[PDB]
Amino acid sequence: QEPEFITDLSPYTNAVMQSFWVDPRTKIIYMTQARPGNHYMLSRLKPNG
Amino acid sequence: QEPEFITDLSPYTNAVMQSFWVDPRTKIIYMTQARPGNHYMLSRLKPNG
Amino acid sequence: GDSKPANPNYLQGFDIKTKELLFKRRIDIGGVNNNFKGDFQEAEGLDMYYDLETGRKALLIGVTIGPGNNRHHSIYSIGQRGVNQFLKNIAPQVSMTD
Amino acid sequence: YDLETGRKALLIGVTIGPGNNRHHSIYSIGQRGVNQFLKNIAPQVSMTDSGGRVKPLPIQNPAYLSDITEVGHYYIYTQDTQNALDFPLPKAFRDAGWFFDVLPGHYNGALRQVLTRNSTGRNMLKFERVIDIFNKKNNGAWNFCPQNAGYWEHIPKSITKLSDLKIVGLDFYITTEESNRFTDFPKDFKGIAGWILEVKSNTPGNTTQVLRRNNFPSAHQFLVRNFGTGGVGKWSLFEGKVVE
Amino acid sequence: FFDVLPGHYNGALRQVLTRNSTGRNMLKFERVIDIFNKKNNGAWNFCPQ
Amino acid sequence: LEVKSNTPGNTTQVLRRNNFPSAHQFLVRNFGTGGVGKWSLFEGKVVE
Amino acid sequence: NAGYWEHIPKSITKLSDLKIVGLDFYITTEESNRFTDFPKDFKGIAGWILEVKSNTPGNTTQVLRRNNFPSAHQFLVRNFGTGGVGKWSLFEGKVVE
């Protein structure tokens, strides 16, 4: 079952994304990137991106 | 049955496309396109064209 | 998955109760033909979207194919019939005109 | 023939548009799931990715920006634009980031390349050119769009002649120390109160540079100098008569 | 006619504004903005047009 | 009237007459942080 | 602009039709004689950059600057269109070291 593209993500951070969850109850994405420091940031964003 | 859109091609040439063929394994579209004279060109394009 | 396309990524599923190996596969996520934007197929996790309307699970994976500081963030899916269509048709992509 | 599920779809090419301008697409009369799959292998090439954000570069730090042949908006960091060579504005000028847009050209193998500095406090500046993807030799020169806000534009002390400043429409500011540093200046007016200059249009190989004086209390003057391979000349002052 | 264009991977975005008038000059302005630190937004450049 | 850039606050204003038969005139000023500015004139020689 | 010169066609024998604002053209010595509204005294002596600028609706301002390298710099001005016809006002510079 070869994959299918879904969407593309447009966060405001220049770091490699590290996790990716979708909310079936509201169709919103939570996208965790690791900032240059130890700290990290999760961006909440729209279904399209 | 009724046709429908799949993808529009984009080869950098100004001529009539003569034919095409998709690769089911690599998903490149090989498009054969005439040229003015006794010559033509084959073009490897992405799925989106 | 490694941070370069030379070492191919791998998704491996296996039962937890028995501690075995059910399967493992290579998948070219992102740029087709292994021709990514530059050379950076840094992999990323994945989850299971369960729509509350139909009840059809759908696996979906994240990938980055961007070179250098410029990072791409692409999403693929191994879902069933009726989930990927729905996920795309929730709302449209951005565009200069509507 | 869907390799995975064994499905099979019948594709048809259709080519529309007038004689020269043509546009050819692939439709399907195929099977369940296959048309969807083909449509969703990869996304349509839009000016930006799905989501409001700049697309990424197709390649790592490119020596030749003409390597980029994909429409859409892109971004070039300071290090990348300093490493590049095809880019205008010499290495000493290169300090800031640049938004690098790419627009469609024509069908015989051409594209555009617009390029705007990420200047917050200073005056932003835009270049733009036409490139030919295959025969890079035909890559036209970078036409500069005059856009200004009101700020100066320093020129670093690395340059030691006003002949390096060949770009038209720009306005570099000069101080007393800078006039005394440079060599080509009028010796009679070299190191007097500083001022701004401005480059003007001319034939290739040469250029006419106008150079004004800033005068709050005093009377005004502005010089002009044509120089290049076609010929070199000295300045020609234009003195002003104060009036109220 | 006011159009927003993508900036870079931090919270930046370009803006352009071109006046609408047939019977006079359609002057345009241009700038950059930072969504997070509104103070860091540039000034209004101008093209002759 | 036309405007030319300078240091912030400072800016040059050029003003050009509009007379077809008579001689042309243009007077330039620089105003802002450095000071108010005094208009310096330049007059032309009618020739053909 | 990048440092090129847009040639004037050979099917134009007047400077009045060049009403394209903000635009620059170049005239060489040999082709600076086929015109009419060109200054007769300065007709065919050196290269001349004309640049156009705006005015009242239906009027334009042309500025003919000489590109002479060794000698002084001259530029002529005229605003033409509605009403009368602009007279070539000259401005000369002082050669200075």
XYZ file of C-alpha atoms in Angstrom, chain D:
244
model
C -1.138 -0.549 -14.491
C -1.133 -0.034 -10.738
C 1.861 -2.084 -9.674
C 0.777 -2.372 -6.060
C -2.923 -3.260 -6.054
C -2.945 -4.680 -9.581
C -5.410 -1.982 -10.586
C -5.257 -0.417 -14.015
C -6.226 2.990 -15.353
C -6.630 4.292 -18.880
C -4.882 7.635 -19.333
C -5.467 10.082 -22.177
C -3.431 13.109 -23.202
C -5.157 16.284 -24.366
C -3.319 19.377 -25.652
C -5.153 22.701 -25.622
C -4.321 26.327 -26.261
C -3.539 28.197 -29.458
C -0.784 27.431 -31.957
C 2.344 28.703 -30.219
C 0.992 28.810 -26.667
C 0.143 25.216 -25.716
C -0.890 23.388 -22.561
C -1.160 19.610 -22.399
C -2.648 17.504 -19.634
C -3.291 13.886 -18.689
C -6.801 12.753 -17.773
C -7.969 9.300 -16.691
C -11.035 7.162 -17.320
C -9.598 4.535 -15.024
C -10.413 2.470 -11.974
C -11.306 2.991 -8.338
C -8.472 4.472 -6.298
C -6.025 4.820 -9.172
C -6.972 8.301 -10.353
C -6.827 9.497 -6.750
C -3.451 7.857 -6.193
C -1.943 9.361 -9.339
C -3.327 12.773 -8.457
C -1.815 12.445 -4.964
C 1.635 10.943 -5.574
C 3.071 14.438 -5.206
C 1.645 17.961 -5.020
C 0.943 20.481 -7.735
C 3.780 22.955 -8.200
C 2.378 26.184 -6.773
C 4.135 29.460 -6.042
C 4.500 28.242 -2.457
C 4.083 24.991 -0.592
C 0.737 24.022 0.898
C 0.837 26.392 3.840
C 2.007 29.967 4.063
C 5.781 29.699 4.010
C 8.578 29.932 1.494
C 9.527 26.832 -0.423
C 13.010 25.419 0.168
C 15.917 25.454 -2.207
C 16.183 22.453 -4.542
C 19.910 22.213 -3.810
C 22.426 23.066 -1.086
C 24.421 26.347 -1.219
C 24.531 26.943 -4.998
C 27.462 28.620 -6.692
C 25.207 29.435 -9.656
C 21.706 30.590 -8.771
C 20.787 29.686 -12.363
C 20.833 26.069 -11.162
C 17.431 26.751 -9.582
C 14.784 26.031 -12.237
C 11.672 25.615 -10.088
C 9.049 28.333 -9.876
C 8.060 29.632 -6.462
C 9.444 31.714 -3.642
C 12.741 30.792 -1.996
C 15.114 32.270 0.564
C 18.882 32.710 0.595
C 20.672 33.171 3.895
C 23.753 35.342 4.344
C 26.238 32.474 4.150
C 24.672 31.119 0.985
C 24.614 34.441 -0.835
C 28.220 35.046 0.225
C 29.257 31.659 -1.153
C 27.419 32.213 -4.442
C 29.082 33.876 -7.446
C 26.352 34.454 -10.041
C 24.654 36.831 -7.621
C 25.047 40.622 -8.055
C 26.456 43.061 -5.526
C 30.036 42.036 -4.637
C 31.114 40.042 -1.627
C 31.709 43.081 0.560
C 28.182 44.334 -0.108
C 26.774 40.879 0.672
C 25.739 40.880 4.348
C 21.972 40.290 4.568
C 19.447 37.664 3.585
C 17.603 37.704 0.291
C 14.173 36.542 -0.796
C 14.726 34.762 -4.122
C 11.572 34.437 -6.194
C 11.381 32.429 -9.409
C 8.654 33.093 -11.946
C 7.801 31.211 -15.141
C 9.495 32.422 -18.289
C 8.527 31.047 -21.679
C 8.242 27.647 -23.311
C 11.551 27.517 -25.185
C 13.379 26.996 -21.871
C 13.359 30.217 -19.847
C 12.505 31.458 -16.375
C 12.817 34.610 -14.303
C 14.726 35.256 -11.103
C 13.658 38.122 -8.857
C 15.713 38.841 -5.767
C 14.946 41.290 -2.955
C 17.197 41.962 0.009
C 15.865 41.301 3.508
C 16.556 44.872 4.536
C 14.592 45.868 7.625
C 16.110 49.202 8.597
C 17.862 50.070 5.352
C 16.428 50.556 1.867
C 15.286 47.282 0.370
C 16.466 46.630 -3.147
C 15.285 44.364 -5.926
C 17.106 42.809 -8.837
C 15.533 40.675 -11.506
C 16.728 38.747 -14.536
C 15.770 36.198 -17.161
C 17.653 32.906 -17.321
C 17.711 30.071 -19.820
C 17.852 26.781 -17.954
C 19.826 24.803 -20.521
C 22.226 27.285 -22.161
C 23.289 29.302 -19.125
C 25.457 31.519 -21.347
C 22.316 33.459 -22.320
C 21.623 34.405 -18.683
C 20.873 38.097 -19.011
C 22.169 40.634 -16.562
C 20.403 41.617 -13.357
C 18.202 44.631 -13.979
C 17.852 46.690 -10.810
C 14.447 48.038 -9.803
C 14.766 51.392 -7.993
C 12.917 51.025 -4.732
C 13.762 53.229 -1.778
C 12.394 54.223 1.614
C 14.559 57.138 2.759
C 17.551 55.476 4.391
C 21.151 55.660 3.289
C 23.148 52.840 1.755
C 26.668 52.571 3.115
C 29.498 51.388 0.911
C 32.246 49.614 2.886
C 35.760 50.982 3.086
C 37.015 47.943 1.147
C 36.156 49.740 -2.093
C 38.705 52.461 -2.869
C 37.410 53.808 -6.194
C 34.086 55.147 -7.410
C 34.439 53.022 -10.564
C 33.418 49.815 -8.779
C 29.922 51.309 -8.322
C 28.544 50.445 -11.748
C 24.961 49.622 -10.712
C 22.379 52.102 -11.966
C 19.741 53.808 -9.860
C 21.521 53.348 -6.524
C 22.283 56.050 -3.973
C 25.340 55.514 -1.784
C 26.043 58.019 0.972
C 29.521 59.417 1.550
C 31.021 61.163 4.565
C 34.146 63.282 4.936
C 36.293 60.310 5.930
C 34.973 58.366 2.947
C 35.698 61.166 0.482
C 39.218 61.380 1.896
C 39.542 57.591 1.677
C 38.534 57.235 -1.957
C 40.844 58.333 -4.777
C 38.690 59.312 -7.765
C 37.016 62.192 -5.903
C 37.533 65.828 -6.942
C 40.603 66.898 -4.995
C 39.193 70.412 -4.646
C 36.137 68.915 -2.896
C 37.740 65.776 -1.431
C 36.974 65.657 2.289
C 34.394 68.446 2.557
C 31.205 67.744 4.520
C 30.379 64.429 2.812
C 27.305 63.851 0.629
C 25.310 61.310 -1.383
C 25.807 60.230 -4.986
C 23.659 58.605 -7.653
C 24.469 56.522 -10.713
C 22.717 57.048 -14.048
C 22.110 55.187 -17.292
C 24.570 54.914 -20.170
C 25.880 52.536 -22.831
C 27.478 49.225 -21.831
C 31.080 49.404 -20.743
C 30.654 52.931 -19.383
C 28.452 54.946 -17.072
C 27.728 58.530 -16.060
C 27.801 59.093 -12.295
C 26.148 62.163 -10.811
C 27.250 63.226 -7.343
C 25.383 65.848 -5.342
C 26.328 67.859 -2.270
C 24.141 68.040 0.825
C 23.729 71.666 1.908
C 21.568 72.771 4.792
C 23.266 76.165 5.403
C 25.292 76.636 2.241
C 24.765 76.689 -1.523
C 24.291 73.559 -3.592
C 26.450 71.832 -6.166
C 26.345 68.603 -8.132
C 29.053 67.067 -10.292
C 28.894 64.505 -13.082
C 31.491 62.130 -14.498
C 31.297 59.796 -17.491
C 33.736 56.890 -17.407
C 34.386 53.464 -18.828
C 35.975 51.567 -21.681
C 34.466 53.891 -24.279
C 36.239 56.791 -22.582
C 37.085 58.362 -19.217
C 36.407 61.944 -18.191
C 36.770 64.269 -15.243
C 33.922 65.864 -13.319
C 31.900 68.926 -14.333
C 30.577 70.940 -11.402
C 27.243 72.767 -11.480
C 27.236 75.674 -9.037
C 24.047 76.955 -7.435
C 22.794 80.460 -6.683
C 21.122 80.786 -3.295
C 17.692 82.417 -3.213
C 14.816 82.820 -0.768
